[PDB]
Design a protein around this ligand. Structure first.
Ligand code: CL
Ligand code: CL
Ligand code: CL
Lengths: 77, 77, 77
């Protein structure tokens, strides 16, 4: 009914292409840390499977680690 | 009875002033990533509305995106 | 039965040694932000007490702040 926080660690050489395909599927993600790049992206419940699948197609093999975390509340100001 | 993790994405030109006013209201936040600056701040349940309001007054219009996330446990060592 | 996300803020002069001893106890952590270094580390329920204890022995006194957060789902690709 509501949101999840995705936290993803992936290979930097997939950072470019993953980021590109997030954009194409209307996912708004933030680049957090590299060496391995960490992204976090707020996603609707409906669309977790969707973003998992995108991360999967563009990353891993390559490597990828993903956390789906609960969100109590979301505000845009 | 307990805590929340706030995760906030805001405009970098509001980073300076938001950070200042967090301090004034005894909020301890960490600067995480910029381009848009990401902050996270551990807050007590009681005080979520408070920190939302601060983020709101000093950021957005400007833009701001905020996640309130559950915390199982908190330790200071 | 499942996982937690640990989020830890500690002193940078303990960053070196904490990181070393995480590795020795098979904890996979990501370095996020410094000034104070922020780490996050995905941990199994079983092993929270374990990683708390490691953070504690190697950090704080020194200072350390730790969040244990719920994880709905975990995927490796
Ligand atoms: Cl990985
Ligand atoms: Cl924004
Ligand atoms: Cl600290």
């Amino acid at each position: 009914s509501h949101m999840k926080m995705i936290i993803a660690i992936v290979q930097d050489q997939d950072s470019q292409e993953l980021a590109d395909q997030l954009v194409k599927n209307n996912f708004r993600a933030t680049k957090l840390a590299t060496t391995n790049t960490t992204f976090l992206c707020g996603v609707n419940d409906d669309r977790v499977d969707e973003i998992l699948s995108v991360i999967n197609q563009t990353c891993g093999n390559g490597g990828a680690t993903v956390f789906v975390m609960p969100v109590d509340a979301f505000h845009q100001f």
